Amino acid sequence: SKGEELFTGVVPILVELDGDVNGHKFSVSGEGEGDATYGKLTLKFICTTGKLPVPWPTLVTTFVQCFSRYPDHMKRHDFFKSAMPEGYVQERTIFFKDDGNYKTRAEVKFEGDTLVNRIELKGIDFKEDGNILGHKLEYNYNSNNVYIMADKQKNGIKVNFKIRHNIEDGSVQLADHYQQNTPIGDGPVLLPDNHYLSTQSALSKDPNEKRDHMVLLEFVTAAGI
Structure with missing residues (x-):
């Protein structure tokens, strides 16, 4: 795509989220960079309102799939880069098993040479001592498969997958993801085959940082064709 050329080198990334989960209001700012040639992302996130009222791992998927590595033979399937620089809207519902849900609306686009992810998150129906509001989730993350298909009535895509967060007692908290993406601009986009x-991903902490924060290292590769 024309958009693919914007990703051949290292690109700065900014993430800005405003959230309300069961009336707990919070904001997060993230900064880092992406290198789509290697499917690679490095970011640091800071809660700017104080303590984060949900576990950091539950927000990883909300916090830029244009940085995925598409193999050369799959490049005609890369919706995300093809929407750039004008960007795309990304909407999700995330259902936490036996607990509440997040609904997110994000716009991902370039602001000058920086790739920006702006998100509004709303969470409802959480248990005040469940694994999310009770902070019972381990600070770690796994390897996942994210399933993609075309949605041509919206010139876009539909995406679904499952995340299993580890609970401190050794059990798992399932988070079912349903996702839709639609382009913002008027240029043509790449509508993919199923893949x-x-x-x-790996989570860590900055030993010198005293604010509530998350450091993230992520690698993503397209496959299944």
Whole structure:
């Protein structure tokens, strides 16, 4: 795509989220960079309102799939880069098993040479001592498969997958993801065949940072064709 050329080098990334989960209001600012040639992302997120009222791992998927590595033979399937620089709207519902849900609306686009993800998140129906509001989730993340298909009535795509967060007692908290993306601009986009993204992520902390924060290293490759 014309959009693919914007991703051949290292690109700065900014993430800005405003959230309300069961009336707990919070904001997060993130900064880092992406190198789509290697499917690679590095970011640091800071809660700017104080303590985050939900576990950091539950927000990873909300916090830029244009940085996925599409193999050359799959490049005609990369919706996300093709929508750039004008960007796309990304909407999700995330259902936490036996607990509440997040609904997110994000716009992903370039602001000058920086790729920006702006998100509004609304969470409702959470248990005040469940695994999310009770902070019972381990600070870690796994490898996942993210399933993608075309949605031509919206010139876009539909995406679904499952995330299993680890609970401190050794059990798992399932988070079912349903996702739709639609282009903002008037340029043509790439509508894909069915395929998936293979992900892996690692969470860490900055030993000198005293604010509530998350450091994220992620690698993602398109596959299944």
